């Protein structure tokens, strides 16, 4: 019956109501010209019709880097020795970044002592 088609199209090959809606319509255009013998034939026909339906809709069912890292290993070693020559600190910005980041963590630790004590409505 039609109940078996739902579990053989929307279930077997995964075909829900909407999927089977246009799946059973494709059979008409190519209905079996005679009473189908095998129960698998019907499923096969449905599956065969599903292919067309799916088609119709278009929805079917090394060391190079080791050589590279040694090149940057040379240039990183060359970068430190030129910064050593020109007396350029390569981390003066980074050391002052982490030293103000704990300094702005101190004033944050003082700023939330106000809002924990007083509250959000009073502070706003």
């Amino acid at each position: 019956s039609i109940t078996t088609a739902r579990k053989y199209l929307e279930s077997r090959f995964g075909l829900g109501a909407g999927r089977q809606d246009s799946v059973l319509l494709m059979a008409l255009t190519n209905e079996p010209a005679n009473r189908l013998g095998s129960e698998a034939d019907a499923k096969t026909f449905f599956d065969g019709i599903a292919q067309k339906y799916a088609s119709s809709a278009g929805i079917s069912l090394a060391a190079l880097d080791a050589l590279t890292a040694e090149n940057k290993k040379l240039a990183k070693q060359q970068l430190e020795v030129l910064a050593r020559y020109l007396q350029v600190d390569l981390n003066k910005g980074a050391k002052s970044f982490i030293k103000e980041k704990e300094a702005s963590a101190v004033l944050q630790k003082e700023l939330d002592l106000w809002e924990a004590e007083h509250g959000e409505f009073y502070a706003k």
Binding site: G18, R19, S22, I59
Partner: peptide
């Protein structure tokens, strides 16, 4: 599978 009515 997308249920298409």
């Amino acid at each position: 599978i997308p249920d298409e009515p």
